[model samples]
Target: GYTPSADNLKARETFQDDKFGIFIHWGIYSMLADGEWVMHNKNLNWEEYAKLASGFYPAKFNAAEWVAAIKASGAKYITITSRHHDGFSMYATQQSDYNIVDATPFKRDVIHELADECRKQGIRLHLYYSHLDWRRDDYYPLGRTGKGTGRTTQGKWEDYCAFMNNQLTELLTNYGLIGAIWFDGMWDKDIYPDGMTAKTWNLNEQYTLIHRLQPACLIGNNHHITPFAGEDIQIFERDLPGENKAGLSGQDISRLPLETCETMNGMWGYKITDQDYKSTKILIQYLVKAAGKNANLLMNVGPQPNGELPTVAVQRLREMGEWMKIYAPTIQGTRGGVVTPRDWGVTTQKGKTLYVHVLNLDDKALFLPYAGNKLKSAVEYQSRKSVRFIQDRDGILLKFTDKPHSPDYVLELTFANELPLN
Candidate 1:
C-alpha cells in the first residue's frame, strides 16, 4: 500500500538497469580463516571472538584499487557489509565503539573509503546491515542462530532496534547517495516460540527512517519471504528468481525489481579451506541466466584478513571484465522475457534487438515456441556472420552452421518492432 516517490521510482529503474553488481562480505570473522558463521559454528562466545577486533588491521586495504577492479569487472554497484551478525560494525558508528574505526587497530573506516572511491569510479554503493547480533545483549529473545555466543543478561529489544536505526542513519548520511540498504538476519526470529508477545521486527519504523533519509534509497531484506510493504526490491539468496534450488527462495516472484546474490566460491567470507571457486565461464553463464529471468546477478567477493582480495578472485574479475568488453551491450540495459530461459540457453532484449545466448545448443538448433515477434535479421553477435532461421506456424527455428565460439554463443536478432511484453 506504500506509494513510492518520483525519485524512488527513478532509482528503481536505474537499479534494474544495473544488470550486474558486486557483494562484499568482510569483517573480523575473516581473522578466523573460516566463513562468516565461524562464531556460531565454533560456539565461540562473544568474549573469545571479540578479541579479533584488536588485531583487525587491514593495512593493505586500497579502496581505489578495489573500486577500479569492480568497475573494470563491469559492475555498476558495490554492496559491502557495513555490519554482519558477528556484532562488529565495519564503519564509524557513534552509537557503538565496537566499530572498525574505534575498536580495531586499523582505525580507518573501510566503508567510508569505499564510498568515496565508488563515487570517483562512477559505481553506486550499497550498505549491508544485519538486524541480528551475536554479541549485543540488546538483541534479546534469542534468534534461531547465534544462541551460543554467551550473553548472561538480556537487554531491551527496543535498544537493539534503536542501535540499528542509528547505524543506518550514519550509513545513509555519511555515504553519498547509497544504492540500497541490503538487510539480513530478520529471519533469525522467524522460528520464535508461539507464546512470545513481540515477534514483530517493527519494519515499518525502520523502513520509514530509511525512506525519510533518502527517498531513492531502496530497501531489500533477505527474509526468504514475499516482498513486504515498503520494500523496493525482491532479493533471492543464492538462487535466481522463481527458483527454489537453494531451498531458501520459495517465495513467489514479485513485480518489484529482482536481485540474486551468489558467491564466487563455496563461502561468503574468507574460508581457508574453501578452494571450490567457480570458473569465469560458469560465472558468465550465471549472469546470462539471471538476465533471462529479468533479474540482476550480484556476485560476491570476500576480502582476506589483510584487506587484500584473493588473487584468484581478482583474476576471475579480470577475466569476466575481458568477456564483458566484448558482450557488455548484450547484458547491460537489456530486459528479459522475450522468451523464458530454456535448456539450450536464455534470451535478453533491448528495444528492437533481441540477444539469444546459446549456452549449449540443442543439436545446434534453437527454437522459440512463441510465434509473436517478427524477426527482421539474425547474426552471430561476435563474428557478425549471418544466421539461418525459418518462421512458420510452429514458431521461429534457428539453425547454427558453426559450433559455440565462446562460452555463450550469442545471436543478435533484430525485430520488426519493439517487443510488447506484458
Candidate 2:
C-alpha cells in the first residue's frame, strides 16, 4: 500500500523537463592544479593533504554571481560537489570539523549560500557526495585505490555507515530543497568479475533515510551498473545514453529518467595547464543529441582554486546562452522522436511537432522509416520556408537544395496528431 506522494511525482516531471544542468567539481584538490585524485595519485598521506584545509579560503566566491551565470546559460539546475573522495566537506556540518566552515579560513558555508542563491535565482541545486573516503579510517577494509592514503587501522564498518548517514542527514535537513544527491566513488570498493561487491554499503537504509527526510529529493549513483531499487535516475558519465565511447556505461537503459554528465574540458577538476576546452559548436550539438535521446545534459565546470569558474568555461557558458536564446523552444519539454539517432542527425518531439536536427548534411539527403503518422507539413526551424520531402510506401525522403545551416539544420515537422513518445 505504499504510494508515491504527489510531491515526489512532480519533482520527477520537473527534472525531466529541465533539459540542461551544470556540474561543478571544486575542493581543496583544485589547489594542487591536478585532478580530484591528487592525494591518491601522488600517494600523499591523509595527514599531509589535510594540512591544505587551513589555506582553503575561497575569498573570491560569489554565490549570486555563480548562480546568475548558470541560470543565464539555460541550465535549470546546478550540481556542486559537497564532498569528494578526499573527505573534505564543502559545507558546514555538525558531524565533522573537517569542513569548509570549521577547518578553513572561509568561515561561511558555501552549500548554504548556494542553496539560498539558487532559490532566489530560480535554479535548482543538487549535491554531489562521494561514497569513498581517502582520509577516514572508517572507510575500511580499504577501497581499491585509497590504500595508499596512510590509514593503519580499520574502524568499525557500522560506524562508518552511520557517519555517512549523519552527514547525508545534515545535507538534506540544513539545505532547504535539494534537487538530488549525486553519489560517486562507490567503485572504490572491490567489484567481483560477476559485478557483486565485497562489502554491503547499507544503501537501502541510507536511501530510506533520504526518502523519509524529503520524498521529492532524487538519488543517482555513478556506479556504472544497473539502477538500484531506490535510485531515481540513470547517469552516463562522459557518454550519451546508449552510446559508450568512454566504455564506462554498458548497462541497459532503465525505465527511470536519464542524465549524461560530460566535462567542458579534458578534466573534471581544475588543472592550470589543461586548456583543452571544447568549442561551442561541439557543446551545443552534444546538448541537442542528448535531448534527442530523451536525456538531460549535466555539463561540468571545474572552478579555479580561488573559487572562481575558469574564464574559458565562462566564455563557453555565455556562448551556450546565446545559442539557447533562439533554440530553447526546440529542446524544452521534448522527448525522443520516431526517428532514432543516426550518424547524420537525431530527432526530438513535443506534442504534434517533430524536430529533426541534421548535424551532418555531407550526404545532402535523409530518409526516415515511416511510423504510420501522416506528416501535415515540414518547414525549416530557423526560417518559415517549406522543406522538400517525399513520402512513399517505403519511407519519407528529404532532399537539401542549398547547403544546410551551420551546426544543425533543424526541420520542424508538424504531424496530424500528437506524437506517441515515451
Candidate 3:
C-alpha cells in the first residue's frame, strides 16, 4: 500500500550517513527495576499492575537535561519509548487513559518535552512504539505465550486494530518531523490475529497513513527473520554486522542502511542489580567494527529510577563522545571498506580517502592488499602526520612514525584514484 518515492531515497541517504544514535527505553517500566518485562514476568493482572502509576512520581525527571546528556554523548538522534508493550504511553493521547500524563501522578508529557529538547539541541528525534501490548486487551488476543509464560485467550481483535490505527495517527500528526519510527514485538501472530505476517503488515493501510502524514519519515521493525518490504532499514539486535575473532557471525550486513541496537549493560530498561556494563575500550571497538562493516550503531541507555543515567554509563558515553570528537571525519558519511583476506582491521571510504580502523593494538604496521590497483597516495589521520608507503609485489606497506597516543588508531589512507572494492 506504500509507494517508494524520491523523498524516500533522500531520507535513506541521510539515515545511512548518521551512523550513530541513542535509543532510550523509558516509561513506567523505569519504575520497575526488574526489567521491561516486569508486568508479564510477575504475572500481575493489567488492572492490578496499573496501580504502580499512582506511585510513579519521578521528581528528578528533566527532559532537557536528558537531551543535553545525549547531545554530549555525540548521538545524532534520540529514540525514546513513546509507548512500550506494557501499553503505557509516554505521550498524551486521547485514545488511551493509560498514558503518562493521565495514568501517573506526574502530569507531564514526556514525549513533548523530549521533542522540544531535541529540537533545541539540533538532534533528530525518533519514537519507539510496540505493536503488541499485553496490558491492552486488544493486542495478542489469542493470549501471550512465550518467554516461559502461559497463554491468555480473551482479547478484542478488531477493536485493538482500530485502537492501534488511532494511536499511530496521533503520533504521526502530533509529533513534528520525526526522524524514524522503530516498532517492536511484531513476531507474535496474535497481534495480527487476522493472519497478518510481516509481508501483510507491510501492506497495511496504517503505513500509508503514516507516509501521507510525514513523507520523509523512515520505518524500521526489528524482526529480522524475513525480508523487509515496507520498512526502510534493517536492525540487528546486540550483534555487529560481520564475523569477528570469536567466530560469531554478525547480523546480515548485505542489507542497505543496516543498524545494530546494543545496550550499554545487560538490560534495555532500568535494572538495579544487573551491572555487567561494557567498558569504554570495548564500546569504541564495537563502534569501529560497526563502521567497518558499513552499518550504523544504535547504542542504548536505560535510565535509572528518578530519570538519571548510571554514573558508569555516563562515563562510558563521555569517553565515546571524546573519541568521536577526534575521529568523526573517519566515521561520518563513509562507505564500507574493501574486504581483506586477513583480519587486519575494518575499512571505510569517502571520496578519495579510505579510512582503515585498526582495532588490535598488537599490530605494528598496517598493510593494504589493494596496493596493486594503482593507489595514488596514503596518509595517517591522527596529528595530520604523513607516512611513507613502499610498493611491493605482494602489497603496499605503510610505515608508522611511532606508537599512537590513543589505543584505537584510525589511519586515513587516501588514493590517487577512486578506490574500488575489488
> Local distance difference test, per candidate?
0.88, 0.87, 0.75
lDDT of 1 by residue, 70-109 (tens): 8888889999999999989998889988989999889998
lDDT of 2 at 203: 80
User: Highest lDDT among the candidates is held by which one?
Assistant: 1
Best by TM-score: 1
Q: Give the TM-score of candidate 2.
A: 0.96
lDDT of 2 by residue, 268-330 (tens): 889888899999999999999999999999999998889898888888999898989888888
RMSD to native, candidate 3: 3.0
Whole-structure CA lDDT of model 1 = 0.88
Model 2, residue 298: distance off in Å is 0.6
**Error of model 3, residue 57, in angstroms:** 1.1
| TM-score, prediction 1 | 0.97
- Model 2: residues with Cα > 4 Å off, grouped in runs: 1-4, 192-199
Which consecutive 10 residues in model 2 have the weakest lDDT in total? 190-199
Compute the lDDT of residue 32 as modeled in candidate 2.
91
TM-score of each: 0.97, 0.96, 0.91
Candidate 3 lDDT, tens digit per residue, 1-422?
45656787798887778788988888777877878888777776777777888888888888888888777766788888888878888899999899889888888898988898888889999889887677764554443433223335556667777787788888888877788888887666645455347443433565666677887778887664543566777777777665433332344554557787888887889898888889888888777778777778898888877878777887888888998888877887876777442455678888777887776645467667765455666667776777778867788777776754444677777767776643
